[model samples]
Target: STGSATTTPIDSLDDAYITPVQIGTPAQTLNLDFDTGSSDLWVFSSETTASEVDGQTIYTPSKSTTAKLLSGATWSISYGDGSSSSGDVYTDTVSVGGLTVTGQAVESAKKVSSSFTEDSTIDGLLGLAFSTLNTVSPTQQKTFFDNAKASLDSPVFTADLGYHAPGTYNFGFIDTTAYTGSITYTAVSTKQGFWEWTSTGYAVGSGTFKSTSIDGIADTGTTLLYLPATVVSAYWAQVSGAKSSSSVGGYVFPCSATLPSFTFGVGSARIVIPGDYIDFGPISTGSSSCFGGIQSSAGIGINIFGDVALKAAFVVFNGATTPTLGFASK
Candidate 1:
């Protein structure tokens, strides 16, 4: 523990937030991020030559007390954020918490972007999303959970993901009492790196977004909750005495004086996202700025439920035998 009387929690998601794990027996650690939007484990290595790359944390496999590499395979990964990495395949012992998974496959990047290379906190990424989003081909691949499950003492392998606290990305076993009941899991779509959902309808305050059910995806990599413009606007229209304000580069609003509550139907199950978390981020809106709520996504992409949406629920990214997402209440 990096103990201190006062600890500023590591946000679960941030521009520079990262999660790392030690790979190798005597515990050679590989600092990485838990990316649910993609499937692949890529690490910045000391083996990466400074002459070819501008800046990178070269991972020294030799310094690792236990290490292994898989020969003849190549790896590459690209994010929606426009950043990417590519490299050769390597296998090593990886550990999180007190559990260790041996001979785990990881990508050793030959070329990496500046965002990932020079980041002060993490050196790599651990993709815990669907295999369809895997950067490594299905034929030559394996997820982190694939290799670790058989050796685990129990049926479940979980990450005690915490935000605003250092070591928030605590991995390994899950504490059942953390929630009230069984976890609700949804099926995944192979088309994207997100967990797809079929919304029966959306309602906010006293208004409804649409009579028709809408479809969306849940993504952990994204920081703010992004919804289809029309849907979000319809919900916001119902807010009584709602005021909009401009923020850093986006829109934000506050309605603490009014009721802020909304619910969406996912298949047969319904989940509620409160108004307090609705304030996206500070955004610009011509004459004035406000908390970002429903903004334009015309040329951008599909809808994504991000961190703000996560705060309202107890999320479990089950990397047990196979990767699955489960939701519970706090």
Candidate 2:
């Protein structure tokens, strides 16, 4: 059985892709970020303090007949930006669009970072990454996709990201109508629990495609495209007024400049990012110096093909005997 769900952006910045998920018995619906970079299906809950909550919704497990506490089980997750959340675990029936899974680990947050409290658009996060990254201790649990893979038609899921609009995330099968041309498949490296793959190379505007190997992950949770400094420099150099500002963070340029397009290779397949997407937005309120969608990931030591790149193509996360990733232009 396969199903598809619509994921909406929180705001104009396209900060996160929020998808609706139903928890407990009668259904406590919450908008959660569909994060592919991490694994931990967590949510704000009744266990959380009212002082820690802003305008976000919370799950009340006690209200659900299916909810069962996993005694002594606890989980914690922290982000690169220092935002973190932690709490206890409970097993309950959870549904995402047309698919439902019983005994899904619903980690309820007892403590959340101020960043989470401030972001009312997202009630929690549903991690689509590998189960190896799950944070539950004592008895580590499986991810929603992992537990339901056997029932899935093809043990696969697909992500179709959009620019400043809504997109689709389908489980168990690929929507043939969602993409164009032929899909290019590649091997994935799950050593670190990331959907990492090597890109054949990249191109700047109308320039030639370089044949260097670049390893990167497909992180829908991240906002921008992060590449090696050399690659980031090449792309931003095309903009006459572009400058890498430490104060503003990353590269910024005049909003009116003609920005060059970015293209990356998947084996022999080419994915082109439009110039319009590269000009992210203003650095400050009503400012003309806009931040770039592509920045240097040098500090992180790995390139990241985030929303800026993912929005340009249809991506497939295949959990087959031999896990592989597929990409196709839409």
Candidate 3:
């Protein structure tokens, strides 16, 4: 079956986008970020400590007759941003858009880091990455999409993230009207629990595209685009007054600088991120410096094509046979 969901921005255009998901028999709903970077369906729950719980909504497994405790099973995960969460596991009915998965492992957070506790808007995360990334212990858990794929007309989902606007996430089907032109398909390596791919290289501004290989992941949860330090330096060097700011963290520049466009080669497609998108608004409120959205992934282990880059095109996550990524101009 095909399902469609409208995604709403959590903050401005650069922050994460969230979609409503139903959990349990009575259909308790929560707004969750559909993250392609991690694989774990985690939620704030009754198990969470009061000190860690903020204004966010909580999921009560006991309230739902279909919720069952996964005996002796637990989950723990940490993101590149240092945010982490640990919790007990429960098997429950979970639905997204119109797709439903029965007896899905839902991790209930007993502990959460400051980053999650502070972001009270998100109740949980619906991980779309490979099942190998799922943190469930005793046995790895399958993702909602993975479990539902067998019943789908086609094993695929499409992400159309908009800039400062609402977009839609379509499952089991792709909306041709949502994107312009044909999509350029590229093979993806899911060995690392991510939708990772290699770019033929990148060019700053209007420069020619190079033929160097740069491996990166398409992460909707990450707000900024992260590349190698050398690539970041090369891009920022073209901008006047741009420098690495330890105080601001990452590269920053005067708010008035005219930024350059960044282009990355994926297969035979040249996906370009506009200059305005590279400027991640002001570094802070009432500050004259703006943070460069495209930064160095120096210690992050892998480059990430975060929301800043993903929003620039229509993304297709195909799971049929070998996983593939198809990108098209928006």
Candidate 4:
């Protein structure tokens, strides 16, 4: 549980964040969740009731300098959390970083969950996963990168999430200085949009998890690292000494002590998760034990390597290359 501590915060820009970069000249910007688990750009509309809109940004076509709504297309998305939203289609010129493109597809929410309506922080979600998950058809599909890639010098996107503070997430061209070296790219597996990979093993701090697990999928939308019971048990066993904390909704070792290191093997490459994440914060007085980020989700589908697992690496989900994700040291 205890290990070195480091902070990672979500990166944000002015009123706009990076997701579906605006298309066309002087692109308008929108902050979106870059999810690797799904595809499509869904935005709340100003037409949404103030109660429903709550704090989330609702895109009002009339408010923008250049906004166009699709004449016939309607869109809706259902999440694993069982929440759903419905909307009509629209296109506009938007920008990401400094790049701009014309005619980008965006969703206008007509119906959304209170959670979506209430959250003041997130304007909408932008799926960065597979093309299969695109809410819009090939004729309608337009991702921030897809629309603007043609303009970028190298068409590279980068995310830099600060530790509980300000950070920068860049799109279009990558700042080579921000990363360690050339990014290691992986080929895509023919499957759903989910990026696939084989895991040689895992670790907590310097100690290795003894259980022999196979390949693990790398996903960005999923929040936690769902692993087999054996692997989770072994991981917890190593941090058995750490006590659960409420603030982080998970177990935390004594802050005074150095925490263990966690790593996962992919191909010949190994990505390490610094000790700061082991207990991810402390527990809160919630119903289900927030437990730890690394917990046993043994009963179901394949093991999901979520964001907590991804924050350790500079990842690239390249849809141009059959929806594959490239990971490397940052």
Candidate 5:
């Protein structure tokens, strides 16, 4: 079966890409972040304390004819950024675009961290990572993509995340017109439930490519690119007014700063991220200071190829055999 979904940027800032998903028999729609870094389809729900939800639409399972409570089952998860959510579980009819999965596990949150509570627009997270990463206790849950893979013409999904623009996530098929040139396939190590891979080298703004290999995960849930401290420092050095800021929690540069392109090598293939994409956006509406899209992955052990880096290329999450990631210029 073929299925696809159009994903739109939450705003023009390239913060997060969200897609519409239908849950339950009567189709309760929720805007969900399609995350590749974790596996669990969770949402704000009636189970969540009223005070814990800050204007987010909650999923009420009882209203759905096909909803089934998984009594005693629970799930809790904490992101690297300190955001956390925990809740009870339910099985329901879940639909994405034109595809539907019957009896799919849907975690309904009863508790949430300040970060999530403050984000009023986000309803939930729809994880696209490996099923093994699911947080449901006693019985791990498979993601919508995994449950629907078998029936797909090709066990693959393409992520066309555009820079500050709407994109598409295609399942069971790959669009030939989405990218330029041949896709460079790399073996993905999913032992940790992430689409982990290695890059042979990288370059800052037109600088010579360093041969230091960098290992990271292609995480769509994350908004910015994170790299090793040393790598971050080296890249910042090329910018005239860039500096580390405690208040900003990372590197910040002048809005008018002329930046250089960043490139990562995937074996013989090289993908370059444009300079403007690295600028992210202004620190605030009229602020001249802007946060660097590339930051230090100090606390987080693994580097992240976040939206800032991923948007420059078309990505294919292939699940046919050994999980593989294909990247190409868009």
Candidate 6:
């Protein structure tokens, strides 16, 4: 059967989007970030330190009759930002929307980084990336999407992240009404365990489309868009009173500056991000300077089309022996 869930922005900056997940027999619902970049379905649990717990809900496996501790199993995952989480493992009945998967590996956190502890909006992360990226040692575990694929009508999931409002996540079948025109499909390089792909080119506003191939990943876990330094520089230059401020760590511009729309090619199709979206978020509360949604990927090595870019279009992650990606304008 097809599955669907609503993804809502956790904060005003649209930093991340989360979906409700029901785990175990009694059904403990937790707000989880359906991250497409990484693979590890981890959650804050009774094993987690009390100090690490704040306003977020914790998953208590002891309360469920179906929860069983996986023997000698442990999982650890680290982010590029240096934040990390690790814990023991369990097999439980995991449900998202109306779809349910029995004996799904659930990573229970014993420790979490302060960065995660401070963010009270998210309770856990339901990884949507390939199962090959799962961090479970001794034996890697399959992601929710991976295990559910055998039962699903199709091996596919779609992410529809909105601005400040709520968006929708669909599984098994594509909702044609969620997007406009036709979806431009492209091959994905899952060797790196990411939804990585190559773009035909990019254009800043209505300017000439610079026909340069760019390799990037569609990562919903990340908040901002990161492109090549040169491309980001070109885009920022078009804005008035913009500068690469060391204080802010990236490009910043006057809040009032009129931003140009950004367009990137997916095969023969091009998806456009509105100029209004270029005005990502304010540097600080009531601050006149705002951070640009597009930042340089020079240090990051690979360009990342995060929520800032995903918010502009509908993205499809296809899970198959031969995987591919799909993009369509909304």
TM-score, each model? 0.74, 0.98, 0.97, 0.78, 0.97, 0.98
Q: Write the per-residue lDDT of candidate 1 for residues 1-330, one digit (tens) a residue.
A: 110011112342233345547765566555566665667877777656465444335566777655655656787777866788887777777765555666777677788776665564666777766655666653456667555556654434333333444324434455566656566776545456455655567677655544555555555565566677666666666665444333343334442334366666544555566665555332434422335444434335776666555545555665443445566665
Q: What lDDT does candidate 1 reach at residue 257?
A: 38
For residues 1-330, could you state the per-residue lDDT of candidate 2 as single tens digits? 877889999998788889999898999999999888888999999998789999899999999999999999999999755789999999999888788999999999999999999999999989888999999997888888888789889899899989888999999998999999999999999998889999999999999999989999998888899999999999888889899999998999998898888999999999999888787788989999999999999878778989999999999999897899999999
Compared with the true structure, what per-residue lDDT tens digits does model 5 show for residues 1-330? 887888988877888898888999789999888999989999999999888999888899999999999988999999888999999999999888888889899999999999988887789999998999999999898998899999898999888898878899888988999999999999899888899998888999878889988989999999998999999999999999999999878899998998889998887888999998998767878999988989999878899999998899999999877999999998
Clashing residue pairs in all predictions, respectively, total: 33, 0, 0, 34, 0, 0
* Model 2 / residue 29 / CA error / Å: 1.0
- Which is superior by TM-score, 5 or 6? 6
Better of 1 and 3 by TM-score: 3
2 or 4, greater by TM-score: 2
| Tens digits of per-residue lDDT for model 3, 1-330 | 988888889887447898999999898898898999999999999999999998988899999999999999999999889899999999999988888889999999999999999988899899999999999998899998899899888899999988888888888988889888889888899889899988888899988777799999999889999999989999999999999988878899999999999998878788888898887778889888988888999978899999888888999999988999999988
Of candidates 4 and 3, the better by lDDT = 3
Query: What TM-score number comes out for model 3?
Result: 0.97
The 10-residue segment of model 5 with minimum total lDDT is: 276-285
Which order, best to worst by lDDT? Answer: 6, 2, 5, 3, 4, 1
- Candidate 2 Cα errors over 4 Å, as ranges: none
lDDT of 6 by residue, 51-163 (tens): 99888899999999999999999999998778899999999999988999999999999999999999998999998888899999999999999989989888899999997
